[PDB]
């Protein structure tokens, strides 16, 4: 009854971080250490748990959030962080128990001349609360003068393209991120280790 982690981790296309995707996982057996050695992940940090310990835990659901960011920014996918990604795109709660997993995706997501399809939100009037998701596109009013879904002075389209060229430094290269949240409700624990 193995869990379909492959669908998430080995997906061909990844969401932009402003529009991060969530897959619900249930009714299956998950081997988290088999997933740990499933590749070389540049980041594999579990916060309320340990991987080898997860294989003797059971949860009612697991949620897998996936998106792309640059290397510099993987540090923002952790509780208590701030910055453009954590404030405006994807916010983990302070009491997070779950795993953050990341790997370098330069060979999939960068393109000679630049791949620009991955976006992030540059401006927002306040910070996202944990797991919130903003896909709106109104023009950000940075000034007195009220704009009008028209870019202009003090008025900025709020989303920006990453630009991934294979020649970028490793900080600037694309990284694919999978966040796993482990949920336990008063209901049958349907996702178990072996």
């Amino acid at each position: 009854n193995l869990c379909p982690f492959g669908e998430v981790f080995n997906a061909t296309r990844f969401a932009s971080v402003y529009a991060w995707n969530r897959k619900r996982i249930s009714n299956c057996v998950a081997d988290y250490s088999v997933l740990y050695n499933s590749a070389s992940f540049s980041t594999f940090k579990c916060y309320g748990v340990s991987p080898t310990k997860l294989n003797d835990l059971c949860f009612t659901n697991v949620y897998a959030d996936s998106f792309v960011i640059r290397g510099d920014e993987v540090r923002q996918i952790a509780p208590g962080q701030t910055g453009k990604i954590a404030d405006y795109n994807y916010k983990l709660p302070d009491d997070f128990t779950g795993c953050v997993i990341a790997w370098n995706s330069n060979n999939l997501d960068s393109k000679v001349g630049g791949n620009y399809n991955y976006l992030y939100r540059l401006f927002r009037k306040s910070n996202l609360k944990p797991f919130e998701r903003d896909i709106s596109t109104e023009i950000y009013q940075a000034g007195s003068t009220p704009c009008n879904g028209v870019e202009g002075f003090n008025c900025y389209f709020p989303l920006q393209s990453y630009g991934f060229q294979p020649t970028n430094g490793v900080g600037y290269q694309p990284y694919r991120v999978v966040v796993l949240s482990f949920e336990l409700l008063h209901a049958p624990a349907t996702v178990c280790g072996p």
Binding site: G113, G114, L122, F123, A142, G143, S144, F153, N154, Y156, Q160, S161, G163, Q165, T167, N168, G169, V170, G171, Y172
Partner: protein
Amino acid sequence: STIEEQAKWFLDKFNHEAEDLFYQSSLASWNYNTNITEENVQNMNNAGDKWSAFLKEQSTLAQMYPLQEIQNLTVKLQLQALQQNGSSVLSEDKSKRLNTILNTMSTIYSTGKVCNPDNPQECLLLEPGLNEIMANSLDYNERLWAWESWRSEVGKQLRPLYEEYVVLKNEMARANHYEDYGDYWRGDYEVNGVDGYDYSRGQLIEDVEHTFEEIKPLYEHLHAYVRAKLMNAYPSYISPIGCLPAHLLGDMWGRFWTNLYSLTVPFGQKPNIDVTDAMVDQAWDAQRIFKEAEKFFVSVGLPNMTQGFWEYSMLTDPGNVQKAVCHPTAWDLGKGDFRILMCTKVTMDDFLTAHHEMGHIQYDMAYAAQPFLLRNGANEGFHEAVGEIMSLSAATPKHLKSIGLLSPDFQEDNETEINFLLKQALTIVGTLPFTYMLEKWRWMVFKGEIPKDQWMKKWWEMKREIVGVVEPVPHDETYCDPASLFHVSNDYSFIRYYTRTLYQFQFQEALCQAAKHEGPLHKCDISNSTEAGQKLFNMLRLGKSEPWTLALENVVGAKNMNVRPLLNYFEPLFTWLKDQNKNSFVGWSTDWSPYA
């Protein structure tokens, strides 16, 4: 809501947008500079156009935030860099014409060939062919042939281009609200918003001249000692009272006198302080040269080179497979991409140059976290100085002994120290009148002080007067000898190499004091000193976030350029030269010519 916070958000936008457009312009230029082709000229033009158009729109917006209401010095500095429109103030036709001029000049410079009278189809480029002659030849006529062919066959091509370049560049500069292109270039040293740390564009000329007055006696005596030695190197060819012939100075121009060391060495029987022969026997190659520079920086606590540096740099000549601009350049392309472009040879010259160019990369890496507009040396002289501070330690006999290029039983005399100081002077002191004179000529051209029919007439008068060097062939206003040098035909400011040379000793004093150094400054090697690494890095990481005058004072305790640390470094050689010259002519007459 406030202007300073509106400007903060605007810069936020600008920095993110700018970084990719700059980077795409850098890649296109890299392609042209490693692979000269017309297809790559047009891509460099297209990416340069795209970047300049974006810069024009963005600077128009930046100029709407009054700087009078900006407290954050770093917000004010970023907006200050966007106060002029830039290159885009030229019409489409003039901008296209200016680009065509720059690309023809740069292509002519590193692909132009001269061919032999003796051989109709041998063909030599400046690099390696003519440079090898101008560095190794001891034959008056061979050296004269390379020096004159280069200027006659390539310099004449550049003369009409250079005339129109002056016109268009000045037009650009007047629209950017400068007097002329030279005034524009001196703007790199301007500092405006900071009380007691300001520096006007006019102050730079006076500081260069006032400080150059203090360098003259040392140069006069190096000049006289070299001229006496050249008399036996070139019997019949050297006047005892005249300028030195321009083609006998060790490179295509006399920019450095380094390659005169073999002819002027004070104590020729001591172990060789030039480690060229030693690295050839040890089978060194370009890779070991750049790996050794890397290990030197790691010794003071600075990072390794990145993986992309080692993967994407061009560290040797690719062949005739493709045409490169061989002139050593340190590239900060953006987005963590750092490269050096260099056609390295197994010489001590290129060993030291590898250390200096990597120092510039070290600088680029240290301020990469700075916001885009402040990712720059505190001024062009700082950026040109860092690598040279390093090579001052990398050149010391003690350092060369410790990397195995001197015998493990090499012992230092007063004689070996005079040898080292003499070779150091041939490079460092020899270049100062060269550098001041070249740039004053350009400043005078730019401000309209030299009629076109007297360009080369004034050029050679100033060589004779300031530099004590004389052309071996009379030269027409069909020539354009300044443009036969890389920096003139590739549109680079040159006074950076003057201010840098004074800075590098000011800095070296402070780094060696941090390393708790024992004795005179020329024996100091900051290797393995992470204290010295730390003081250097803390200045490097600032970029242009602080005015250079405050930045300099934080390291060395002075707000201005100062000649005293350079003169003190060379003092033991200065005392020696004065005694050596006691039976020789010192000074030069400008009337003698090799030709008559």
